[PDB]
């Protein structure tokens, strides 16, 4: 029988229809418009509250906490220019204190515009939120954060008026305000992100402010967004050497995001395996988000060493996705806490590489294989990548033939059958009978039949030779 | 599991007319629950061969 | 089978060295320093009477 191919895979369905992809795109567009509508409604409510407090309260002076909450809600929605005269008035009235300055600088990083940029603009890539929040006035919000940092340090020097030459630089409030400054400067453009471990960290050292774990995590995240991995791994090695009981998961998220940005995915796998090994600090859904996005970025990466001779090579890394998801079921990380775009890619890689036992008993039926062949024959112009177009180390002088008796054990059946007439002058050396040299199953009978036929034709040839040479 | 996945896919590039089977001996924690399976005294009326 | 066992052993050597190096780079980070899991600490203090 014709042989079947054992290196050809079983035909199975791994893909979606054009209608299902169109409905996925339509539903994701609807979710993006819903998030945009929610942010615009909240921003309109905040601006209406500001216009109410500016119009109706023209001469009636408000309490300072209402103005502080209004400035916080204005800065959180990306309206920083409408909040800075409120902060100037509150600082001029000396109503702001140590926590209120850090609250204002943390609100200057706009964590309500960031949610809209996350769900609509960045398509839920958390590094792209930092990359896209620098467009909405990065340098101006950075200058306002530096100005509010100077205001905060002046008010901390006022509020601390022994340890007298070491105040307010030795207090917790200076470190909290510096952490708020770094967290706000991460939101801005690339210049301030690069200046976080360069200028801000050296200024915090020269001022004599003792850092905390959030300081090192924000410096690691700034170096992650820069793409400098040896310095971020050096900072985590410093934290592992000295202050190891204080390390939280944000440093692991910084390294995952940074090795994803530097496109060193083996380091992403190493960091994820280390986080699964130690199990403390606990893996957030941001860990699974960053690791699965690094997997999807590596799997969609085209290679150039085989030059795409047969197919794309990196797609087999999507086979890592049904493993790591199971690890999430051991880590207590809920898989429903993943974004919709990443969930679409994870279900893509799951329907490409996952099967159950009940399907594995039925997936090789000839009906499904021939339906696969018929569906490729009828409409393969819709789904095809090409249709779009002794010991050797102590051996040196080897001892041969050491009187090991091969006659104690039994190997007597070493019979071989050679073809008839190897040195015969009448039998030709070249011939089709050379094809008899490669035949194993019926070897003995074929050699005996060939020898009998050759003996018979040589005997008949010499008989005819004698009869003709004697007849004349 | 990264190695077990890589070990199972040797079956897709094997030689001609050459198959394989896999053996796995791994360590697994077993809990003996002393409340589901308690250690109690023998009953007053014991069991016999007729049971 | 002898030529296959040279093809698979060379395959599992390079794969198995890459996986153990991925585990060795994690173990040497776990030995430099880390924080004790509170669930791991609760597992040691679980018995009523100790030794």
């Amino acid at each position: 029988r014709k042989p079947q191919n054992q290196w050809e895979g079983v035909y199975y369905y791994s893909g979606i229809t054009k209608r299902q992809r169109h409905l996925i795109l339509l539903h994701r567009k609807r979710e993006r418009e819903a998030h945009m509508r929610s942010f615009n409604i909240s921003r309109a409510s905040v601006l209406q509250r500001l216009e109410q407090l500016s119009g109706d309260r023209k001469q009636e002076s408000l309490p300072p906490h209402v103005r502080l909450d209004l400035a916080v809600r204005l800065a959180q929605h990306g309206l920083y220019q409408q909040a800075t005269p409120i902060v100037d008035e509150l600082h001029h009235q000396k109503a702001l204190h140590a926590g209120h300055y850090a609250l204002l600088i943390n609100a200057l990083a706009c964590p309500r515009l960031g949610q809209r940029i996350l769900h609509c603009d960045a398509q839920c890539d958390p590094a792209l939120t930092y990359k896209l929040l620098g467009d909405e006035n990065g340098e101006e919000r950075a200058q306002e954060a530096y100005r509010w940092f100077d205001l905060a340090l002046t008010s901390l020097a006022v509020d601390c008026g022994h340890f007298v030459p070491y105040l307010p630089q030795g207090t917790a409030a200076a470190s909290h305000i510096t952490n708020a400054l770094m967290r706000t400067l991460l939101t801005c453009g690339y210049t301030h992100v690069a200046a976080i471990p360069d200028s801000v960290y050296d200024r915090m050292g020269s001022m004599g402010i003792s850092p905390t774990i959030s300081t090192y995590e924000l410096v690691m995240l700034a170096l992650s967004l820069q793409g400098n991995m040896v310095e971020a791994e050096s900072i985590l090695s410093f934290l592992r050497s000295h202050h190891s009981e204080h390390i939280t998961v944000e440093s692991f998220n910084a390294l995952l995001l940074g090795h994803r940005e530097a496109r060193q995915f083996d380091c992403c796998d190493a960091i994820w395996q280390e986080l699964v090994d130690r199990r403390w600090p606990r893996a957030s859904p941001l860990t699974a988000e960053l690791y699965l996005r690094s997997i999807m970025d590596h799997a969609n990466t085209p290679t150039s060493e085989p030059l795409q001779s047969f197919a794309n090579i990196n797609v087999v890394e999507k086979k890592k996705v049904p493993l790591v998801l199971a690890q999430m079921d051991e880590l207590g990380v809920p898989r429903t806490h993943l974004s919709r775009v990443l969930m679409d890619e994870v279900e893509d890689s799951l329907r490409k590489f996952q099967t159950y036992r009940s399907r594995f008993y039925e997936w090789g039926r000839a009906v499904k294989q021939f339906d696969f062949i018929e569906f490729r024959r009828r409409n393969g112009w819709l789904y095809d990548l090409h249709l779009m177009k002794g010991d050797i180390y102590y051996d040196d002088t080897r001892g041969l033939h050491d009187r090991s008796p091969t006659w104690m054990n039994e190997v007597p059946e070493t019979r071989y059958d050679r073809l008839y007439g190897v040195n015969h002058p009448d039998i030709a050396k070249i011939g089709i009978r050379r094809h008899l040299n490669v035949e194993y199953v019926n070897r003995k009978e074929v050699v005996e039949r060939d020898a009998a036929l050759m003996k018979k034709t040589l005997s008949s040839g010499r008989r005819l030779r004698h009869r003709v040479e004697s007849s004349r | 599991t990264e190695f077990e996945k890589r070990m199972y896919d040797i079956r897709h590039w094997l030689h001609r007319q050459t198959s394989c089977e896999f053996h796995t001996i791994y360590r697994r924690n077993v809990i003996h629950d002393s409340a589901v399976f308690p250690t109690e005294h023998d009953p007053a009326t014991p069991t016999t061969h007729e049971h | 089978v002898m030529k296959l066992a040279e093809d698979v052993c060379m395959f599992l050597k390079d794969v198995g060295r890459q996986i153990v190096e991925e585990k060795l780079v994690a173990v040497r980070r776990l030995l430099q320093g880390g924080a004790v899991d509170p669930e791991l600490l609760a597992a040691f203090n679980c018995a009523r009477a100790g030794p």
Binding site: A311, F375, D384 | - | -
Partner: peptide, 30 residues
């Protein structure tokens, strides 16, 4: 016609058919 047994029994060429053709799931049963 066949492959001889003293020849090296390597794989001749790999086949990427499920990654060239991505088929949606279609059964006759609902």
């Amino acid at each position: 016609y066949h492959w001889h047994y003293n020849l090296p029994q390597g794989m001749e060429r790999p086949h990427s058919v499920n990654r060239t053709f991505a088929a949606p799931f279609q059964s006759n049963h609902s």
